[PDB]
Amino acid sequence: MTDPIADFLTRLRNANSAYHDEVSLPHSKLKANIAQILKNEGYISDFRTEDARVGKSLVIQLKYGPSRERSIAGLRRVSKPGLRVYAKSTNLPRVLGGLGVAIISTSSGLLTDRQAARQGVGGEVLAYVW
Amino acid sequence: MPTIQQLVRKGRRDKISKVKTAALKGSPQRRGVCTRVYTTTPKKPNSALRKVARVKLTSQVEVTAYIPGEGHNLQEHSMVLVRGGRVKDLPGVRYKIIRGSLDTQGVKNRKQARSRYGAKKEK
C-alpha cells in the first residue's frame, strides 16, 4: 500500500465513471488542500472535512447536474514515486492550453498553472485534471 | 521493457540489423576475377535460366553474381565490377556485375535505358 494520490484520484475516476454521489476517503493535509484548489477551479462540487472515529475523513461531492454529464473528464498523475518530475517556470506544462490544470508544489505551496506562470516559479508537477 | 528502474538496472538495445554484404567491408563495388559461368535454374514458379558466375573478389572469396542483360562475352575470366542488388529467385545470388565496364562490353542493340547494361548512344 502506497501512493495515496493514486487512490485519491482513482476513487474519483470510479465515481465519475459510475456517477455516484460522493467519495469518502481518509483525511490528510494534501488531500484537503488539493480539494480546495479543485473546488476553486470548479471542476468538483463541494467537499467536507468529516471525522468519523479512527482519524479524520473527507467527502467529495461529484460535480454534475446540467445533465447526467459529469463536469470531470478524467486525470493522470505524472510524478510517480520513482519518477519525480519537477519543472522550471519557463518550461511549465501546457497541457490542454489553459484547460489541463496541473497542480504544482512550489516554494510557496500548491497552485495552478496560470498562477505559477504569473509568479514565475517552478516546482513539482503532481497531476493533471484534463 | 517498462519499469524505469528496470531500465536503469538494465539498459536497452534494438534488434541488430545484419550487415547485408561481404563486399570488402561493404565498399560499394569491387573487382572480381570473374570465373565459372553457370546458367542455373531458379525456384519452381519461374521456369527460366539465369546467367550467373562463381567469381573471386579481392577479399579472396567465391561469390555468386548475376549477369544482367542478354548475351555475354565471358570465358570464366575477364574481370568484372560487382555491385549490389538481389533476385530472390536464385538462392545464393547476392551480387550483380555491371555490363560494359573494365572488361565486359555493354549489351548490344539496346536502345532504352542507355545508362545501364553498358548501353550507349548510337555513336
Binding site: G42, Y43, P66, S71, I72, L96, G97, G98, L99, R114 | -
Partner: protein, 160 residues
C-alpha cells in the same frame, strides 16, 4: 450539397457450395466544409448501390465539430476499440497533415490547420472510427464553462 470523399474500396467473398459470391463495398464520407460530417460504409454487389447506401448512412449520421476558425480546441487522443490517432490544433497550422483518409475526413470537415498522425492499426476503417472518436471527445470553451464557472479566463489570445 455536400462534399464527397471516398475511401479505397475493398472486396468480400461469401463462399457457397458452388463457389464464391464476390461483393464490393467502400467506406464513403461527406461533409459540408463546416464539421458536419457524415460517415457511411454500405455494401452490395453493385459498387454504386453500396455507395449510395453509404451516402444515406452519412445523411443519417452527422457530428458537429467544435471548430475554431478551421481547427480544433485542444489535442486529442483518438483511441478507439482498435485504432489510435493522436492529433493537435497546430494553432498556426497553415496546412492540414494527417494520414490516409483521415485527411479526407478533414477535407469533409473543412479544416485548414491540423497536425495529426495515425498509430496502431492501419486498417483504414478503424482508423476512421478512431478519428470519429477523437471528434466526439472534443469540446468548446463555453461548454467547459458548463463544467466550471468563470469562463473566458483561459489561454486563447486568438479565438475569433
Amino acid at each position: 450539397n455536400y462534399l464527397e470523399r471516398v475511401v479505397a474500396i475493398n472486396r468480400v467473398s461469401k463462399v457457397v457450395k458452388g463457389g464464391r459470391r464476390f461483393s464490393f463495398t467502400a467506406l464513403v464520407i461527406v461533409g459540408d466544409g463546416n464539421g458536419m460530417v457524415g460517415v457511411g460504409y454500405g455494401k452490395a454487389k453493385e459498387v454504386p448501390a453500396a455507395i449510395a447506401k453509404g451516402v444515406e448512412e452519412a445523411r443519417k449520421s452527422f457530428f458537429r465539430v467544435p471548430l475554431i476558425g478551421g481547427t480544433i480546441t485542444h489535442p486529442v487522443q483518438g483511441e478507439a476499440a482498435a485504432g489510435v490517432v493522436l492529433l493537435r490544433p497546430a494553432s498556426p497550422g497553415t496546412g492540414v497533415i494527417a494520414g490516409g483518409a483521415a485527411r479526407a475526413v478533414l477535407e469533409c470537415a473543412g479544416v485548414h490547420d491540423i497536425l495529426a498522425k495515425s498509430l496502431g492499426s492501419d486498417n483504414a476503417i478503424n482508423v476512421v472510427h478512431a478519428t470519429v472518436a477523437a471528434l466526439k471527445l472534443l469540446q468548446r470553451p463555453e461548454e467547459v464553462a458548463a463544467r466550471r464557472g468563470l469562463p473566458i479566463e483561459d489561454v486563447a489570445p486568438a479565438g475569433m
